[PDB]
Amino acid sequence: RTGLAEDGAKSVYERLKNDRAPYETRAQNCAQYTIPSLFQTPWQAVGARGLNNLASKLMLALFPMQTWMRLTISEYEAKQLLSDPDGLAKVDEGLSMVERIIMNYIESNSYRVTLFEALKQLVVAGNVLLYLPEPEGSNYNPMKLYRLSSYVVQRDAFGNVLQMVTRDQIAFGALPEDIRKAVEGQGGEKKADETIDVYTHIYLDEDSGEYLRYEEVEGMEVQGSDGTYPKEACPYIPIRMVRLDGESYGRSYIEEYLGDLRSLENLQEAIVKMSMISSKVIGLVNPAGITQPRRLTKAQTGDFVTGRPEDISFLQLEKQADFTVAKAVSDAIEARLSFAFMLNSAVQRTGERVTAEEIRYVASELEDTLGGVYSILSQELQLPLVRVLLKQLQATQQIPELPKEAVEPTISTGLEAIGRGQDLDKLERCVTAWAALAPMRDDPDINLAMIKLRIANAIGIDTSGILLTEEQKQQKMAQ
Amino acid sequence: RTGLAEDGAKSVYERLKNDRAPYETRAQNCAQYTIPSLFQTPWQAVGARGLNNLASKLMLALFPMQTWMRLTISEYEAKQLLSDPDGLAKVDEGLSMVERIIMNYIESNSYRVTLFEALKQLVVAGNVLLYLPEPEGSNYNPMKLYRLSSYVVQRDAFGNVLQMVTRDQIAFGALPEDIRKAVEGQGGEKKADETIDVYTHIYLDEDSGEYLRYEEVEGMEVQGSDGTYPKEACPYIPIRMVRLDGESYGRSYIEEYLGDLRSLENLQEAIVKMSMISSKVIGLVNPAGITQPRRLTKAQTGDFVTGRPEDISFLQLEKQADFTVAKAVSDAIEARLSFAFMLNSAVQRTGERVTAEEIRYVASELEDTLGGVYSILSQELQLPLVRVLLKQLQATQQIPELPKEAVEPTISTGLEAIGRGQDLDKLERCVTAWAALAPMRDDPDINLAMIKLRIANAIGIDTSGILLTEEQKQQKMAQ
Amino acid sequence: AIVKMSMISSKVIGLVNPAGITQPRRLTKAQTGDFVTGRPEDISFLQLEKQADFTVAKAVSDAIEARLSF
């Protein structure tokens, strides 16, 4: 074979590993000051608690136990079945069964627990790509996360992906049997401890636009694992926190705010260290004085010992005056970071009893920030995940066959998909605004048929199978 | 035998014991500053009280006395019985009897009391695996918890488990009779005191994908205990607090926040030690002065003694100035840890009378954190537990036989499963939104049949056996 | 400049008079609750004590922070 792997994947991995190195060190920097174990352990938990809340508060809105995508009938299909109501009813029933299948798959296949780490890592790193390869209908298809450190990607100036490579080091103890043999014959006498790196390369076929995979184990192949992928659906997904116009990767959310994060840690730790000095009781006996250490060190309470106070002092550094200046600043940054990590208690920074309304106003800002990040993250990670899972399930045919109208639907996400839809809110607000013109349903020179429409128009309902057609209006008026 | 135990389990235990050693020391560190007896006794209880609340507050939502899983009819089975209502009713009745069986089993078999320690340990340690081996319908099947220290596990880069080993040291006084003989018929005259380590090895059969067990007692076997396990259902469960992309184990929740926990202990204990010094009354008599200790030490109140005040002083270290600097920081960390241990009283950190609303906002952040951790922990520990118990009970046939439609159901957990379902909330909100279009049930040119659907669509009800079918609509209109 | 300033205020440096009896080693190593030979006068700490200027800087940083915020 040739193409983009003219001489293996390792070669392509090393070539891109130089473009990735800035993002990689940036990610390790962010991790150090927040929670390091995502790339020893820091002097504050402020950043840590923030990142934790940011992941929680994100996924609980993005990936809750509620159904959070709604498949809508394709526009042409909707048009083709116009005002054929029994069928359209059954179609929604069909896709809204699909709604449940993928969800009941996700909750059982343990996608959520990994998507947590995915968001955590996607926040501190900027990129963190996901494999959901083998449905294997019978058993667990666990999701697999490849953190920024142990993978690499290349893109074109548009956004499209050409080639990605992922390294996995497992030590030959926990290898599948096909590679265990393809390894121990070409290599040496291996042990469970040693450690083997299995690269994985995906090209874009340079004419028949489709992704091709193979698995390299030291300038070799797996002698079996190589499979194909269409461009539209690839079970190998590279997400992106904070896009850039070109490049290949994306910016850690927790970067622009690090300027202060670093400022806080290197200060916080000095304060903690300072406190540890203030707390230390050391007693300075004048060796020229009469008061001798032992008689005190051993003396219990209520005693009387020979000596005067002047022979003894205690360290008493008394630099509160500086401390208060350091603290007053540590809290000022802690507050700014708090607001930047969606952390309620941005509202309370001591002072006075912040009154009841400048809470629900500061709240609206925090909700705006989370909502903006939510919409981007939702739109980018949420839809690629759904589109891939939909195609995978259609291929295995765990989707008991549908009518023609539900082979290619559209994929509403976020609010619309859960109960509290705005489609709905528009619908019910119109119905009530229709109840409004009851006191003139017996209209002397007032045309309800027209108003009843213009209202639904301004609100923006479909008005399809709603306003009884001129013919159906006249037909029903006689009954 | 051979496979993954080419020469016993002890060998595999020792090989993996080196990969486990970092997690193990990390766990002992966490424990030291929280509650140490989970791996002498510390100077503060803050962390202790936090871990306690964290376990309580978790399990009370995860594992309450209420029924907290609901088995739903498999999707194909639902489709196959579409609009056959008497049967579907009876099906729900059937699984909702299964709902009660497993629960009545769990409450009687004392699962909750162990699952407490499981969560406590899973919080401080990162992993803590669970055995629920023998149903023994007649009596107690107690749950068995193997703490991180006395077990070990290996995984593949996917999540799947290959081999686990558990050590149990009991001293030959409390051994079953088969090992008691298989032990003293190899190794020595043994007393009730001595102490015997029984290892326990589980392979993945390297072609007929199924878990195989045996029980080793010193490079030997139990001569009986060896049994098999299918891959889908193993009564040997390894949970995971905070996943990692690879490895084998998981991260203690109480790790990233330790950075401050350690900082607090080593300070707190200095303060306590400082206080004990401040409280100590030592009286310094000048031996050159006239005032003599005896006369005072023995003198009662209201007396008059010969001497002047200048001959006597008291220790008076007077380093409040430093203390206030130390305290002001101890409380600042105490507050950040409190928030990180779901501890209400995160809201009150003295200052002023925190007003009425920036409580229910700081609450929403604490509920979000607990809710996120809950969803992961629920999804990971809750569903593996249920799936295992369901299969075990089906095998012993304590599940009086069901129709074909309830051999492989789906397993809803969390909110859906208890009364307050979102499925329910959507249903009732639609029904009321339908009551909304009563003032136009006598519709002049307004099609209710269509609106009454589109509402249930936007909300996301099934609409199955709800909107009377075109034929059933026309059939009932004549009656 | 404030962040930098704080970093200076936080820094604990202890000035032993080399003419005095109180010697660094015995303190640096001494744990809490101890007694060491020497007097307080031989030792001080840096104590820059320019809060007076800080407060003037802060009161202005926050005034601009407020206008930018809006």
Numbering used by the authors:
A (entry chain C), B (entry chain D): 5 to 43, 55 to 494
C (entry chain B): 285 to 354
Quote the passages of the study that discuss this structure, keeping the authors' original sentences:
Phage portal proteins are key viral components located in a single pentameric vertex of the capsid and they act as initiators of capsid assembly. They are also critical components of the DNA-packaging complex and are involved in tail assembly. Here we report a number of crystal and high-resolution cryo-electron microscopy (cryo-EM) structures of the T7 bacteriophage portal (gp8). The structures show two conformations—open and closed—of the portal and suggest a possible mechanism of the channel valve that regulates DNA passage.
